[PDB]
């Protein structure tokens with residue numbers, strides 16, 4: 350509902366540290382791995398498996414075990430500068446092509 354942050358500055362700098370993001374999950378019952386989530390820049394909101402990226406502020410939910418944090422981050426928040434710093438544009442293009450092709 351809010352626009353995604355495409356600047357090089359994090360929307361939520363309180364969640365910029367991996368350890369800070371890790372704390373937000375607590376006991377995590379969900380199919381997708383919390384450390385893998387925190388590495389993809391995601392922190393938990395405390396309602397179901399709702400996560401937000403610390404940098405773009407981009408929010409995701411209803412994590413199937415087939416869904417990957419970095420892939421979902423790229424699918425839904427392609428303009429995220431954190432995503433770009435960590436993964437690079439070669440990775441990001443693959444994800445886009447793969448999912449844009451996945452539709453068939």
Ligand SMILES: C[C@@H]1CN(CC(=O)N2CC(C)(C)c3ncc(Cc4ccccc4)cc32)[C@@H](C(=O)N2CCOCC2)C[NH2+]1
Nearest residue numbers: 350394398399400401407408409410411412413416421425
């Ligand atoms: C891990 C994947 C994510 N999918 C996309 C998803 O989660 N998106 C896409 C988008 C950007 C339109 C969206 N906007 C709002 C919410 C809620 C929200 C609000 C603040 C914080 C976190 C979550 C979620 C969401 C899931 C997906 O395909 N979904 C179909 C649509 O409804 C959500 C599930 C499947 N799992």
Ligand code: NA
Nearest residue numbers: 374375376395
């Ligand atoms: Na929790």
Ligand SMILES: [Zn+2]
Nearest residue numbers: 402404405429
């Ligand atoms: Zn992001």
